[PDB]
Coordinates of C-alpha atoms and ligand atoms in Angstrom, one line a residue:
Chain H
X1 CA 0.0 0.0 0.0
X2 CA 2.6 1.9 0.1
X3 CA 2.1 3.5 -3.8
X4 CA -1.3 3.7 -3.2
X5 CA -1.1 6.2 0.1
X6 CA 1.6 8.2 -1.3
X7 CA 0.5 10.8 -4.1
X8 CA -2.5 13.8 -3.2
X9 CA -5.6 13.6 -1.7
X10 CA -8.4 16.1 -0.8
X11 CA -11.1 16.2 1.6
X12 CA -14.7 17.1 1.8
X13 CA -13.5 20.2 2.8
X14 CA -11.3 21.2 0.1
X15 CA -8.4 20.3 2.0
X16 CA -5.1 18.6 0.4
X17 CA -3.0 15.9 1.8
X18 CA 0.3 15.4 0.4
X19 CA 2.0 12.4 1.5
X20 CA 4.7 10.3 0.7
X21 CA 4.7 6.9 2.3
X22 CA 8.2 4.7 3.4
X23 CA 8.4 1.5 2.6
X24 CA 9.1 1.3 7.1
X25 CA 5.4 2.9 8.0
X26 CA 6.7 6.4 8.2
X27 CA 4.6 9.0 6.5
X28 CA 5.7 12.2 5.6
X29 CA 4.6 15.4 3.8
X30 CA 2.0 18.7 3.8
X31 CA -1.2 19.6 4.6
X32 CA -2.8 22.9 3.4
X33 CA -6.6 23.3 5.3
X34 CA -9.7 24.7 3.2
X35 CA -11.1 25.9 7.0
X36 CA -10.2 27.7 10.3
X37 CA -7.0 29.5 11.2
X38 CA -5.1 27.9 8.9
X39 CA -2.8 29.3 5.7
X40 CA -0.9 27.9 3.3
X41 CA 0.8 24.6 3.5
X42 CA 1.8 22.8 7.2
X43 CA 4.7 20.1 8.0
X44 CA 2.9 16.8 8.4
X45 CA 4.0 13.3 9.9
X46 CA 2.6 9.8 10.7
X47 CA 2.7 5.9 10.9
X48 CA 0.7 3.4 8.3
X49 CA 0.7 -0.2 8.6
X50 CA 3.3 -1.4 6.0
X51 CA 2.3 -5.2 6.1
X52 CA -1.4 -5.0 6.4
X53 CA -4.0 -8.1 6.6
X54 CA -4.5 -9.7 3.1
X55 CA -8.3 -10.6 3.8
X56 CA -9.8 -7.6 2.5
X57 CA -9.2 -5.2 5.1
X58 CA -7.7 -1.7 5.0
X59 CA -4.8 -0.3 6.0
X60 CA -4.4 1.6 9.4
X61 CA -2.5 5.1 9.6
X62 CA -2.8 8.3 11.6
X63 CA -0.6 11.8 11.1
X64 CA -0.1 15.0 12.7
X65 CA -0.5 18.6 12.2
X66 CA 0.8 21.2 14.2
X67 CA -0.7 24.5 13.1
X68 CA 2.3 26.6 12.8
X69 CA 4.2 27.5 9.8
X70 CA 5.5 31.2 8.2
X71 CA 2.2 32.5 8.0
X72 CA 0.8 31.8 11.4
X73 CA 0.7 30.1 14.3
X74 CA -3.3 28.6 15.7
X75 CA -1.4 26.8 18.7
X76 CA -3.0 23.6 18.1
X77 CA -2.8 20.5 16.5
X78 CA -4.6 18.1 14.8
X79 CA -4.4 14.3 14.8
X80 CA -6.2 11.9 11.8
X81 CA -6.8 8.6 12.8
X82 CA -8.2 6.4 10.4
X83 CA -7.6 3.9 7.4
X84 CA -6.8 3.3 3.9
X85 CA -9.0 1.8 1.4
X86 CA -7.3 0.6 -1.9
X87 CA -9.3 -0.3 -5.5
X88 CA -11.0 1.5 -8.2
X89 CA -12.3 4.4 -5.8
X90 CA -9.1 4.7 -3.5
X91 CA -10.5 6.6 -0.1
X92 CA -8.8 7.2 3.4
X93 CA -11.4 7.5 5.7
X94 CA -10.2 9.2 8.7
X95 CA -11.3 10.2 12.8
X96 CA -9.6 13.4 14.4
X97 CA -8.6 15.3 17.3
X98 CA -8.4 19.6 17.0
X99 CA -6.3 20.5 20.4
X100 CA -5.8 24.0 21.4
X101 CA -3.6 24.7 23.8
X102 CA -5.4 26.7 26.5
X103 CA -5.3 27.1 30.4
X104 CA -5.7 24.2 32.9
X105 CA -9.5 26.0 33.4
X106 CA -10.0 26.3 29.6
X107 CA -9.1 22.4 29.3
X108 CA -12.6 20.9 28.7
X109 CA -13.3 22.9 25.9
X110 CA -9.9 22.6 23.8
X111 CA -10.3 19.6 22.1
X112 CA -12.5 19.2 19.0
X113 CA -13.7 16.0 17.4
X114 CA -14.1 15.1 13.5
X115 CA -14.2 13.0 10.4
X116 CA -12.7 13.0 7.2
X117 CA -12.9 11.2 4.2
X118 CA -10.1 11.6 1.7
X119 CA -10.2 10.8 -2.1
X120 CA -7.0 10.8 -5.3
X121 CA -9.9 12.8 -7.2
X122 CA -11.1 16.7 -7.3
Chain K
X1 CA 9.1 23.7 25.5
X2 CA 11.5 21.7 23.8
X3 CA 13.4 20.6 26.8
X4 CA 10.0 20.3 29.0
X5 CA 9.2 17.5 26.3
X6 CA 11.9 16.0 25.5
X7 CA 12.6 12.7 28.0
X8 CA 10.7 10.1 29.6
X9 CA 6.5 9.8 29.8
X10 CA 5.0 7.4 31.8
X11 CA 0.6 7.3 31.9
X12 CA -2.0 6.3 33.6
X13 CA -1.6 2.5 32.4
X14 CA 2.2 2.0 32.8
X15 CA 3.0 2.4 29.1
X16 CA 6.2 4.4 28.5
X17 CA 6.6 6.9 26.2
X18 CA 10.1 8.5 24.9
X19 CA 9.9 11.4 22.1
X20 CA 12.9 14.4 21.3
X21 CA 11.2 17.7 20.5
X22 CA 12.9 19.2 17.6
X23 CA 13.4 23.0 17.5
X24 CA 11.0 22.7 14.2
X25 CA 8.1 21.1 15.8
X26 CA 9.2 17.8 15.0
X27 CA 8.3 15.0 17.6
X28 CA 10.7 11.3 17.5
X29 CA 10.9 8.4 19.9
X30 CA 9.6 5.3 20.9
X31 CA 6.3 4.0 22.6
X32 CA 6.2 0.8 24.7
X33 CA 1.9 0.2 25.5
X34 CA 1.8 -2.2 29.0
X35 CA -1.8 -2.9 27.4
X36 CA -3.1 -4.6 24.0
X37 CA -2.1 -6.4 21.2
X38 CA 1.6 -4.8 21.9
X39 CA 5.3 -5.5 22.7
X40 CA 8.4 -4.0 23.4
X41 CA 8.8 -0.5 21.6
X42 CA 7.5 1.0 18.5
X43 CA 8.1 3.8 16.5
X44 CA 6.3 7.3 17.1
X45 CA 6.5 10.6 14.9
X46 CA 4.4 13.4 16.0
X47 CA 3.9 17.5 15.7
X48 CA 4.5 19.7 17.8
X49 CA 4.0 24.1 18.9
X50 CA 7.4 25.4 19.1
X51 CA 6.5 28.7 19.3
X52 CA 3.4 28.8 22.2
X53 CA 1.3 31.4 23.4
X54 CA 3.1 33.3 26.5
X55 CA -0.2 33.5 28.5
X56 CA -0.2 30.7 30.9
X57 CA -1.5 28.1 27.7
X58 CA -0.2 25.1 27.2
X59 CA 1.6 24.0 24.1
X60 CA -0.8 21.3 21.7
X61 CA 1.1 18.5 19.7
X62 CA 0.0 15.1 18.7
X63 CA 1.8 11.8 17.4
X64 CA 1.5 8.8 15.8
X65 CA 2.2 4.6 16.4
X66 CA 1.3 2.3 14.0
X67 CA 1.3 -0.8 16.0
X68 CA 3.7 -2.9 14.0
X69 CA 7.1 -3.6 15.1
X70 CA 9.9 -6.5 14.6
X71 CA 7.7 -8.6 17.6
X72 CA 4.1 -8.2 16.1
X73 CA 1.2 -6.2 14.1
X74 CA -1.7 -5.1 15.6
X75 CA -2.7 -4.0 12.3
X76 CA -3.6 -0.5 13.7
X77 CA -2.5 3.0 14.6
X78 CA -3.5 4.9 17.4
X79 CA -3.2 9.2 17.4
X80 CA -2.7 11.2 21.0
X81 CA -3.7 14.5 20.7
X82 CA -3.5 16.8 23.5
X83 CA -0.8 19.4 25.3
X84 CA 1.8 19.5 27.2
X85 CA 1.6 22.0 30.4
X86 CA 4.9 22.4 32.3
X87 CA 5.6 22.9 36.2
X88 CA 6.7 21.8 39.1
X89 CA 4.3 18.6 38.3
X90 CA 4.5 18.6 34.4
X91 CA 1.8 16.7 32.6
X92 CA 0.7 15.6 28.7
X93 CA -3.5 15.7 28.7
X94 CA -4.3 13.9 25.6
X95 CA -7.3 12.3 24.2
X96 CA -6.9 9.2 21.5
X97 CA -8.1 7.5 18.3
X98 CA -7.2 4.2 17.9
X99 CA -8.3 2.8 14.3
X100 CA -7.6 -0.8 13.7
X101 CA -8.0 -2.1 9.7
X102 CA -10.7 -3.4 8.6
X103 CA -13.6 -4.6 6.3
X104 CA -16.2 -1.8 4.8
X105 CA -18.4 -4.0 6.2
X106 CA -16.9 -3.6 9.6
X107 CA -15.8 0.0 9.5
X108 CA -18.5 1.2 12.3
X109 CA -16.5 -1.0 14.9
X110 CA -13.2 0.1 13.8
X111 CA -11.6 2.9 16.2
X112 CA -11.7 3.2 19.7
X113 CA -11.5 6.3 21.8
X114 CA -9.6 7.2 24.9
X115 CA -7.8 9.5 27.0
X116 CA -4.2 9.1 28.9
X117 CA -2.2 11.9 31.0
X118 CA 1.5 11.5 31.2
X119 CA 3.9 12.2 33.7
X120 CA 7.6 12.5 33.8
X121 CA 7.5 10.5 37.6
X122 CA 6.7 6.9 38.1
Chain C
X1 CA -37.7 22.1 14.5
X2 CA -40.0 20.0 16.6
X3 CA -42.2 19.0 13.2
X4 CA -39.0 17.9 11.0
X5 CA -37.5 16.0 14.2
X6 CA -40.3 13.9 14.5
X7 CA -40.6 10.9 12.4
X8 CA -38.6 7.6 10.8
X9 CA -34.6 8.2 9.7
X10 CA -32.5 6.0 8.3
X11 CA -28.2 6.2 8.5
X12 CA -25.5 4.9 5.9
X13 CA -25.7 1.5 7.8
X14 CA -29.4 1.0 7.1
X15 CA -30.1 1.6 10.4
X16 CA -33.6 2.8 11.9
X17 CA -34.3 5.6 14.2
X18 CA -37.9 6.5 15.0
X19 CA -37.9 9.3 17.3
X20 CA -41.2 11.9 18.6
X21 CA -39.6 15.4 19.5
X22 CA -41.5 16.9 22.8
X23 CA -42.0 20.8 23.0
X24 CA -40.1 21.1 25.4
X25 CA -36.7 19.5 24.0
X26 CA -37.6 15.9 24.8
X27 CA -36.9 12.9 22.7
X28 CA -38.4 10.0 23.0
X29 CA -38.2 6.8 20.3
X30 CA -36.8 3.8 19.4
X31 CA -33.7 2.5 17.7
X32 CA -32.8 -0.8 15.2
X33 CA -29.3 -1.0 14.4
X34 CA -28.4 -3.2 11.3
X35 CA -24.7 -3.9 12.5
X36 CA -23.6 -4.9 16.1
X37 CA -24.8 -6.8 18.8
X38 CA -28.3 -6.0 18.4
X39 CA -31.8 -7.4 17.1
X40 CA -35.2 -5.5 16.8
X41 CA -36.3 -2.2 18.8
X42 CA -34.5 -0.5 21.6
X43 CA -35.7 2.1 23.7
X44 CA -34.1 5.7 23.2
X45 CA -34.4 8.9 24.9
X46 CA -32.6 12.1 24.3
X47 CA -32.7 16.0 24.2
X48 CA -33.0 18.4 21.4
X49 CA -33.0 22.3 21.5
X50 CA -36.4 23.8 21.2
X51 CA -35.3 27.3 20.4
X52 CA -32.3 27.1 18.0
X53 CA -30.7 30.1 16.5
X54 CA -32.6 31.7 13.8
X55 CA -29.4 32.7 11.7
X56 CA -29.2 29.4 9.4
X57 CA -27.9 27.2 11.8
X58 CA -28.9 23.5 12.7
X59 CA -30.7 22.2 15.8
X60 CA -28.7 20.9 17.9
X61 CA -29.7 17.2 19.5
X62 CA -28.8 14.0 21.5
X63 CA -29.8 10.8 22.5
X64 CA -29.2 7.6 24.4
X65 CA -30.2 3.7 23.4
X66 CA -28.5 1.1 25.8
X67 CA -28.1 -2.1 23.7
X68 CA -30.8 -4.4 26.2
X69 CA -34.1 -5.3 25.2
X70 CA -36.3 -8.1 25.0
X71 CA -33.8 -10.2 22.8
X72 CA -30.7 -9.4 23.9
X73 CA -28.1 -7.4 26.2
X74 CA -25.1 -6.1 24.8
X75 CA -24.1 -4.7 28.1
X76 CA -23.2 -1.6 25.9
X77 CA -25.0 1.9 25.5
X78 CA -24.6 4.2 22.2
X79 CA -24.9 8.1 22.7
X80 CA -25.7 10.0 19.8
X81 CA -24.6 13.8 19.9
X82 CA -25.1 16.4 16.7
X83 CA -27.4 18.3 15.1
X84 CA -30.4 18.5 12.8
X85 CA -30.7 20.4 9.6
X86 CA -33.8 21.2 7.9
X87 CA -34.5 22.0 4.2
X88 CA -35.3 20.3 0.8
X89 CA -32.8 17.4 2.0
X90 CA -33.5 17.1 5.9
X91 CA -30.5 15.2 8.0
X92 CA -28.9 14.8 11.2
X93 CA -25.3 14.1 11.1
X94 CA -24.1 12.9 14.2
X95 CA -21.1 11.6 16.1
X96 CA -21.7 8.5 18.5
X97 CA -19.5 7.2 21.5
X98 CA -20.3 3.7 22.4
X99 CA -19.4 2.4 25.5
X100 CA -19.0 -1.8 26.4
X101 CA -19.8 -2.3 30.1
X102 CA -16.3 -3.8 31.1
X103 CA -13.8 -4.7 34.1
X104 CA -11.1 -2.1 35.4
X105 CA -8.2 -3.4 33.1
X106 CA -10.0 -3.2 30.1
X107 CA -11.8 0.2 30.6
X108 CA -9.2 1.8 27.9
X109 CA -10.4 -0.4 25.2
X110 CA -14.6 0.2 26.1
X111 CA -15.6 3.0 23.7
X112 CA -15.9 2.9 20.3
X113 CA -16.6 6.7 18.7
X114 CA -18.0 7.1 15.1
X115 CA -21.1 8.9 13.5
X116 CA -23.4 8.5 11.5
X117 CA -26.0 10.6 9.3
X118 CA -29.3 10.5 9.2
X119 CA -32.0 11.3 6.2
X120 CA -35.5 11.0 6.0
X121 CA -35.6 8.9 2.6
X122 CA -34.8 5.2 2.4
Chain T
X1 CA -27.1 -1.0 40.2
X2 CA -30.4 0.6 40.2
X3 CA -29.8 1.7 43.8
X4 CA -26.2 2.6 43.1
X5 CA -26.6 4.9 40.0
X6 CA -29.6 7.0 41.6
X7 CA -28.5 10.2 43.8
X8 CA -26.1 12.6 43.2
X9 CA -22.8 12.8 41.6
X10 CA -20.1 15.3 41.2
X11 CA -17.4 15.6 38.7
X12 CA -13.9 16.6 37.8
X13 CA -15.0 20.5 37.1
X14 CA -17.0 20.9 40.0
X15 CA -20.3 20.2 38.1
X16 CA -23.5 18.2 40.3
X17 CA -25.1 15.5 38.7
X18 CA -28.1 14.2 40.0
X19 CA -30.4 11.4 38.5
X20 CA -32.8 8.5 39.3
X21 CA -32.5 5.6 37.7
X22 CA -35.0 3.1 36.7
X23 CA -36.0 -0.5 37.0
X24 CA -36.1 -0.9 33.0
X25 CA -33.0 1.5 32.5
X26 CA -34.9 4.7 32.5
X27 CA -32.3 7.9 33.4
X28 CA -34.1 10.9 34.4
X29 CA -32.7 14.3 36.4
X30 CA -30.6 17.0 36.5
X31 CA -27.4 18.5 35.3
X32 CA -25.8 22.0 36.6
X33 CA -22.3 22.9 35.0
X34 CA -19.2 24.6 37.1
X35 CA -18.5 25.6 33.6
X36 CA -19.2 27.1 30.0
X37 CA -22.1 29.0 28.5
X38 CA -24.7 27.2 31.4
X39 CA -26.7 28.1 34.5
X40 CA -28.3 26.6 37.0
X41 CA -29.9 23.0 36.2
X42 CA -30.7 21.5 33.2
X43 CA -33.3 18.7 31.7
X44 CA -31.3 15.3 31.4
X45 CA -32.3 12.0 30.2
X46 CA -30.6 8.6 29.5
X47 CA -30.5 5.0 29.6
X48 CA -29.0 2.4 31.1
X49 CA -27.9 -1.2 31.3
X50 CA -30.7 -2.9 34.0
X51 CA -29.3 -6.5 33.4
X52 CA -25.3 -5.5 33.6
X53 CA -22.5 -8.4 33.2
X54 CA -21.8 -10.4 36.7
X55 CA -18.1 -11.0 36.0
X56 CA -16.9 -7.7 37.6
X57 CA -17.5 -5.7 34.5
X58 CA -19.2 -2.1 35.2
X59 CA -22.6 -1.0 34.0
X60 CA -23.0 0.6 30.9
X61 CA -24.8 3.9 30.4
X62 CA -25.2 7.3 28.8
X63 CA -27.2 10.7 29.3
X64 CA -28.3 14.1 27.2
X65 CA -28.7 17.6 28.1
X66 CA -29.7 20.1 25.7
X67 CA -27.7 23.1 27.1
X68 CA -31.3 25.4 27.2
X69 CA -33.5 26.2 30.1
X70 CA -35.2 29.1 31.7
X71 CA -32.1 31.3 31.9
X72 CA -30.1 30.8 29.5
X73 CA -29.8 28.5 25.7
X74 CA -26.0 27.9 24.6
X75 CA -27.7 26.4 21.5
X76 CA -25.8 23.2 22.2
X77 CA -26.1 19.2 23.1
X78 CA -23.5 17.3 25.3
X79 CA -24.0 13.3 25.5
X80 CA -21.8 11.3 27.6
X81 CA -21.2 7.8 27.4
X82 CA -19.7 5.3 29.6
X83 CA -19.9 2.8 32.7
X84 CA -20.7 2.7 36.5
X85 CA -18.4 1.1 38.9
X86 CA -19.7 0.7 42.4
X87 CA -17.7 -0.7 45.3
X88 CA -15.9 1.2 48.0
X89 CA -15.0 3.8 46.0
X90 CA -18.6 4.2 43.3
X91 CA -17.8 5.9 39.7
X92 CA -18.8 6.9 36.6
X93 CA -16.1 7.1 34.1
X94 CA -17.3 8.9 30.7
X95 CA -16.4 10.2 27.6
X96 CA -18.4 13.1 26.2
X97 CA -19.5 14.9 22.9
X98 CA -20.6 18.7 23.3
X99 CA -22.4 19.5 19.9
X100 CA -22.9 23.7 19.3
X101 CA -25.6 24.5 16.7
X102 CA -24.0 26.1 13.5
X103 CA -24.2 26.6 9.5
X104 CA -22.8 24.1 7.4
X105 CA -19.8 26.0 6.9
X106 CA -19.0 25.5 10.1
X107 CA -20.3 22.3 11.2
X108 CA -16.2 21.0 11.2
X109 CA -16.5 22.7 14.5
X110 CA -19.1 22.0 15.8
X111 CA -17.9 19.1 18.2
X112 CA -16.1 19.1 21.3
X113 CA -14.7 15.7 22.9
X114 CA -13.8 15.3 26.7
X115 CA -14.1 12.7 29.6
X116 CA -16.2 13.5 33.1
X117 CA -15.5 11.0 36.1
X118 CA -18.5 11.4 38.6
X119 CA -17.9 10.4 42.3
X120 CA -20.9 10.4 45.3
X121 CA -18.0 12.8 47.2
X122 CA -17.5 16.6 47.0
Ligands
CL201 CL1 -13.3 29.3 8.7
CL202 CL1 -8.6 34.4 7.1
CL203 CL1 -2.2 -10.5 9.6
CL204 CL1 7.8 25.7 12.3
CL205 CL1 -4.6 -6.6 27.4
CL206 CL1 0.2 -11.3 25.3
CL207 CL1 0.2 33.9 20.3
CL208 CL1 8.3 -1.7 10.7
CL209 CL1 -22.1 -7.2 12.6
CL210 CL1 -26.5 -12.3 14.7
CL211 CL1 -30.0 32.7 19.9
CL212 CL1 -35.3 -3.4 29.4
CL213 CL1 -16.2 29.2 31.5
CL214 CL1 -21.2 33.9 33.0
CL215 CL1 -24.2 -11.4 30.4
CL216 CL1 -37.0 24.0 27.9
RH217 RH1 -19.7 12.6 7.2
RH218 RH1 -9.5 9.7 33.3
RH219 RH1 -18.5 9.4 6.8
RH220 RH1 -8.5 12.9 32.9

């Protein structure tokens, strides 16, 4: 799976995911956000499965975003968790965590929770 | 905050958790779970703010394991994201998405979700 | 919002939630999931608000079916929290946490988290 | 633990939980949050496991409040889900989802994720 993760993908958002995939698990590459305080393209870094089940099933990987580059700085960061889907319609469907860093009294409210689906298309 | 991170973590479950913060934002070490489908160390890459805000905030970051090593595959990844808050008692607060591959069919069942704090004692 | 809450949805698993919204913000229903550990009606309840913001935005909602009826007991409970939108194409799009009734050593693998989305048609 | 869920319960943030459960796996009360856009009490319901697992496991449950009463509306949901643990030292361990109202552009964030642990004490 590792040609079929590496390449660009885009979200529901608009977002795009560039990521080039080791042949070890790592994952490497940038992430530029359609939404929020975000601008530009951001370092991103992960793990994949390199030697995933053969019976059909897809291929697990996560990566993180710290949202801080030239342009700006959110201070927070955003973890994907989720897996890749190979064949005709390629998709990485994806969970993830939005922290901000805040105060130890502003720590209930600083995490936010998503999904994302990613596709090689649009 | 890159020498507040950098070092030894420890949670709530006995796992143990060893990352150097680059001066980038770049996260690297090693994560050893005491629970699950896991043994001895795998690798970790994660993200992190080098540049936090200066008003008592903590700093966000997030990383990665896929859990395949030389020992076994779990055939999944699991994401922390959270920040670190420094002090006399440092602490990482972090929230988790654990994806493990799988059919379309059973997709709905596929990540789990969690929370562990980590301290430099114990 | 308490006329389009009120009546049969279906999700992407082909799921069934029948749910009657109270003036007052109460929901009151029942549930059939098509996946899982799970076989004809459950009992749900849940809360809605009755005076959402008139600017556009959705109505926002939750609600709670543990996994025992007359059939079976999964010794699990499923909390739905999101938000309904109205229009031409009516849904509520959701995220779920669901929690397996377990012992102390394997509370951090209890809760599964995904969501779902909910239409009228189908 | 139809006698052991009903009374009231306190959490992490300060906040007073107070329910009555029962004998089919009814949860009915009130909740009043130490923090965020909330005052005084608040409409909850839930459900529960009646029948939970006799091998030490904990109970499974989960609960709504739509964030509007008399005083104020912060246009907003939270659902927790999780177990009971009685014993010496009676819990409930949760993980919540705190969904705000909002317009499709925004609906990416429109979720906040944390985890509550009630106690009888305090
Ligand atoms: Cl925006
Ligand atoms: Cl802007
Ligand atoms: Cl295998
Ligand atoms: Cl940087
Ligand atoms: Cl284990
Ligand atoms: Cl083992
Ligand atoms: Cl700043
Ligand atoms: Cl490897
Ligand atoms: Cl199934
Ligand atoms: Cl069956
Ligand atoms: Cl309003
Ligand atoms: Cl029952
Ligand atoms: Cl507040
Ligand atoms: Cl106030
Ligand atoms: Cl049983
Ligand atoms: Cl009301
Ligand atoms: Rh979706
Ligand atoms: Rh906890
Ligand atoms: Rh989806
Ligand atoms: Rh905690």
């Amino acid at each position: 799976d590792e040609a079929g993760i590496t390449g660009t993908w885009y979200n529901q958002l608009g977002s795009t995911f560039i990521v080039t995939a080791g042949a070890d698990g790592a994952l490497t590459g940038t992430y530029e956000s359609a939404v929020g305080n975000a601008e530009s393209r951001y370092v991103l870094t992960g793990r994949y499965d390199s030697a995933p089940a053969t019976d059909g099933s897809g291929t697990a990987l996560g990566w993180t975003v710290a949202w801080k580059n030239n342009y700006r700085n959110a201070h927070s960061a955003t973890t994907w968790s989720g897996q890749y889907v190979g064949g005709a319609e390629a998709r990485i469907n994806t969970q993830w965590l939005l922290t901000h860093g805040t105060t130890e009294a502003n720590a209930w409210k600083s995490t936010l929770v998503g999904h994302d689906t990613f596709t090689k298309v649009k």
